[PDB]
Design a protein around this ligand. Structure first.
Ligand SMILES: Nc1ncnc2c1ncn2[C@@H]1O[C@H](COP(=O)(O)OP(=O)(O)OP(=O)(O)O)[C@@H](O)[C@H]1O
Ligand SMILES: [Zn+2]
Lengths: 225, 525, 228, 143
């Protein structure tokens, strides 16, 4: 997960919709296209939860995407058309939105990408596993324990773990070379600060718009002196 | 305590005492049985000379698992056929003394000018007891004739006959062979022994069609017998059976007076009833319940099919029918896929053989034997391939397996010490067979490395687009990537693979780092 | 016409002929400088031989007017094409089938990931099982990437959705040792104990151990710099 | 087609073979029965009533469609099989080959799994759509 910087509201036709009218299915294709125009802009080309690429650069409607509401419709019906409850999720039938609604859970123990930074709780590994950081209190530990369980982001084997491991191992050559140059610089004798700054900014430039960008960022910063 | 020393001690003691009762409780017999129980049966070495397409070969077999890998024209099934010939002799002598086995027929010998005969050499090891057998056959019109040597096999089979003579609950080794024709056998298309003895299994070695029908009859009989246990019938049933047997005996006596087939059938029925009465007496003496065997077989089959809930026998239309519940739908046997039929028949046959050969063991799935399987990965998707080996060696841990495979996925789950690679290398104009081992350990590695090392094949295809990628990579690594030709090649690569493909991204990273290296050098120059 | 069709399908051979010897008769195939009896062929080559022979036999008889009868029209269905085939054979069967008969429509089902790596992504369908409104039904999807020319495991992971790395017990110690290394706890006694088992099972020169040692050295140098 | 075991990969191929059987029978002779759907092949769910198969054959711009259905025990069925579209095509081929000889015909073949005049001088049998591999002995003798 990655922190989302929500921009100014763009509900458009959503404002025209009425709570009393309801009828979520009554939305036309034009409104859906308008919503997707803003959603792609804010979310990039990655899924909110699993960060699998959702839109490919332009024959078939690959990577089917469905609009998902953060909260359940039945008991938070007042937020059916709420702007802040809109999210974009992939079409995977075993995780993300299609898997969130199949279980019973407490609504007060979920991490929201637009509210709190996920980097505080989670810590990714090279092999593709997820490790909960230590030192947190009881409520945060319970929150992190349950969000992975509901979203199925921590399977025993296969699933998203295999894909994450493959993505990590493909980009390891760049990380190894960058730290190779860093070592040289340091040893030779150059202002640590400068070196750092550069090795970071450039990596961030070269990693933007990629699949599983946080896992690669975590791996790189772990090995970057 | 060497096995031979206790064998000769019992042999010399048998001649003195004539009473059988003293012999049955003799200390020497107890020592012989005790030392026989922990003697693990396993073959050691094998060699082939001028048999079919093979000129010469020497192979060492592991005691737990062996896998043969490689493609060639001689056919690896020939090696398994050689083993099937040798074990046949061992089975024959057990059935009856000096019974002939299987000979090498004339046409299996090589057709080359400089050949005269074909031979097969094998060795069997039981703890510290070693035996060897040689089987040979010469061509027609040869100046010298050759004969087999059956001293060791006859001696080994005599011990089993001796032990089985005094104790009626002796355990015997298991031998089986599953060829590639079982695919038709397991089809189960829509095509009654009252007592079962361990000698029925020894009728044939190779898996055949009639085994499935015998499996159905055995399952029906076992379920019916377990029904009486469920009803908890008292000893009055035994009295009724004894009365029926007495009436049959009186009818036989009347028949003997003033119909040979009828007499034979009545005698066979009387013998079967006497066997059933002896089974009732053993029930009084207590034994493993038919319910325990029934659920042992059902759970054994269910271990390999995790997608099924239960299997039951349903009596309808004056007949029996097998019903399997998958998910929330009841299914018939004939409606299953090919893979499930194959697994169902293979595991059912193995379980039946092991159960029938060890009537005395508390858990009959722990007997000894040797099993040869050809093309283990028939009709199996990659998910099942990675777990079939572990389940096979976990359900039956005391049985030695010899397997030939063709898939890297299966090969990635076996240790590197159980892999033999067969290669044909032409030396001095003559093709020669050699056996090698993998360079590195292959247990737990990815299936690509298992294909690269265990099979020595390139895991990347040679399509036209691969040539484009390789050529572009050479230019990038050679630092003159900035050229018109490279631009033309790159446009083709982007057109085919696409800009978001990871392979193209790796090349982009290679370009970027090279561009940055001179920039950083210039910055701190 | 039949013989030439088979020769075109397999260009590794020079000619095929039937020879009546002094006492026997047999079919001889020549490749390079070696002549092989037809019976010496393996099971896979026999299967290919009879499949191509039957296809050519039907095509010749159905088009008696065309100059080249190999340009007919029709539909052919093949089930489990990868049966009884070595991996080296599986990597070229599709190209030859689609090049010998260029005007026929093919429908093929397969289990081997090696075949998938030679097929374009526009002709791949994947069958899954999903439940909608309480009813479980099948569904058809498409691959999200291009799988032509990629390695074997990439094709297995993307075109079949399966883990390419087994879950063996010996693997269990590997990820635990890796995880302890990444948490800067490689000097712990538990890591030292686990390293004995791993190094015993794999060996010093195995590449997996080599990369682990490289990570150890990198982390050690970073700790040295941070400490100073 | 890629999938696991028990996912209906062989069902699709058998469905297409069922569809093509009727066209072949009509080509050989008008008003000839093809291959029917077996009773055990129907779904075993509680609420099912009938099973239907539909197909579309496109020849340049000419289009045709064939539907075959069978009901096990449902009171209401989908009438009968609609074979009107395939009879026009069969009559077209019969017309073209009746006047001018040495014509051409489409090829239909199905290489199944284990399971289990009129140019007959050569001994090749066109009557059977199904053919089985691993029969090298027969082809060797034919050659
Ligand atoms: N009458 C039936 N009702 C419901 N499901 C059935 C019925 N008959 C068969 N099936 C289903 O058919 C499935 C197997 O179908 P199928 O033979 O197409 O599988 P496959 O693995 O693709 O086959 P193959 O190995 O022949 O290619 C089983 O899982 C079973 O659930
Ligand atoms: Zn997602």
């Amino acid at each position: 997960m990655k922190y989302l910087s929500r921009q100014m509201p763009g509900p458009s036709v959503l404002n025209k919709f009425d709570y009393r009218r309801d009828d979520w299915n009554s939305l036309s294709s034009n409104d859906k296209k308008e919503i997707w125009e803003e959603i792609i802009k804010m979310q990039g080309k990655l899924c909110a939860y699993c960060e699998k690429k959702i839109e490919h650069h332009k024959g078939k409607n690959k990577v089917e995407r469905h609009i998902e509401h953060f909260y359940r419709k039945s008991y938070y019906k007042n937020l059916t058309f709420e702007w802040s409850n809109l999210f974009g999720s992939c079409g995977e039938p075993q995780r993300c939105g299609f898997y969130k609604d199949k279980q019973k859970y407490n609504d007060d123990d979920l991490i929201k990408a637009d509210r709190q930074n996920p980097d505080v709780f989670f810590h990714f590994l090279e092999n593709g596993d997820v490790h909960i950081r230590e030192g947190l209190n009881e409520k945060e530990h319970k929150m992190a324990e349950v969000t992975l369980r509901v979203f199925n982001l921590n399977p025993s084997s296969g699933g998203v773990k295999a894909e994450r491991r493959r993505a990590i191992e493909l980009s390891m050559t760049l990380i190894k070379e960058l730290v190779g140059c860093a070592s040289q610089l340091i040893e030779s004798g150059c202002e640590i600060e400068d070196v750092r700054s550069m090795v970071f900014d450039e990596f961030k430039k070269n990693v933007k718009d990629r699949c599983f960008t946080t896992a690669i960022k975590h791996v790189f910063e772990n090995r970057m002196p | 305590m060497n096995l031979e020393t206790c064998y000769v001690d019992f042999l010399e003691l048998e001649s003195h005492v004539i009473n059988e009762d003293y012999l049955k409780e003799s200390v020497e017999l107890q020592k012989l049985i005790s030392t026989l129980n922990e003697s693990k049966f396993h073959l050691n070495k094998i060699g082939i000379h001028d048999f079919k397409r093979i000129r010469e070969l020497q192979i060492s077999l592991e005691d737990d698992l062996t896998v043969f890998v490689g493609d060639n024209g001689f056919g690896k099934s020939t090696i398994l056929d050689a083993i099937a010939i040798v074990l046949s002799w061992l089975r024959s002598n057990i059935e009856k003394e000096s019974k002939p086995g299987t000979y090498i027929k004339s046409h299996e010998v090589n057709n080359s000018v400089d050949v005269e005969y074909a031979s097969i050499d094998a060795n069997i090891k039981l703890k510290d007891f070693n035996t060897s057998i040689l089987i040979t056959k010469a061509k027609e019109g040869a100046y010298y004739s050759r004969n087999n040597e059956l001293l060791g096999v006859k001696k080994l089979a005599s011990i089993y006959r001796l032990v089985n003579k005094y104790v009626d609950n002796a355990s015997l080794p298991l031998m089986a062979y599953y060829s590639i024709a079982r695919s038709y056998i397991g089809g189960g298309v829509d095509r009654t022994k009252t007592v079962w003895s361990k000698f029925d299994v020894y009728d044939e070695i190779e898996f055949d069609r009639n085994d499935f029908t015998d499996f159905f009859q055995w399952l029906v009989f076992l379920h019916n017998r377990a029904s009486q246990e469920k009803l908890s019938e008292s000893q009055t049933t035994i009295n009724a059976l004894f009365s029926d047997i007495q009436s049959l005996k009186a009818t036989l006596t009347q028949l003997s007076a003033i119909d040979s087939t009828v007499i034979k059938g009545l005698e066979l029925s009387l013998k079967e009833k006497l066997n059933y009465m002896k089974s009732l007496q053993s029930g009084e003496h207590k034994f493993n319940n038919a319910v325990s065997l029934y659920d042992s077989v059902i759970n054994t089959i269910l271990k390999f099919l995790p997608e099924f809930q239960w299997i039951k026998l349903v009596y309808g239309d004056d007949d029996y029918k097998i019903i399997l519940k998958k998910g929330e739908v009841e299914l018939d046997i004939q409606q299953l896929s090919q893979g499930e039929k194959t697994i169902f028949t293979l595991v059912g046959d193995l379980a039946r053989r092991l159960i029938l050969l060890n009537p005395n063991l508390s858990n009959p799935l722990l007997g000894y034997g040797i099993v040869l399987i050809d093309e283990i990965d028939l009709h199996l998707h990659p998910q099942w391939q990675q777990t079939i080996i572990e389940r096979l060696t976990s359900t039956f841990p005391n049985v030695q397996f010899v397997i030939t495979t063709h898939s890297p996925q299966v090969l990635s789950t076996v240790s590197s010490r159980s892999v033999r690679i067969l290669q044909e290398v032409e030396v001095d104009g003559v093709n020669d067979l050699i056996v090698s081992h993998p360079d590195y350990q292959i247990k737990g590695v990815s299936n690509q490395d298992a294909l690269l090392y265990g099979m020595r094949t390139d895991p990347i295809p040679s399509t036209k687009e691969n040539g484009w990628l390789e050529e572009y990579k050479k230019l990038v690594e050679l630092n003159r990537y900035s050229s018109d030709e490279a631009l033309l090649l790159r446009e083709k690569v982007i057109k085919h693979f696409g800009l978001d493909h990871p392979l193209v991204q790796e090349c982009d990273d290679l370009i970027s780092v090279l561009e940055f290296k001179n920039k950083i050098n210039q910055h701190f120059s």
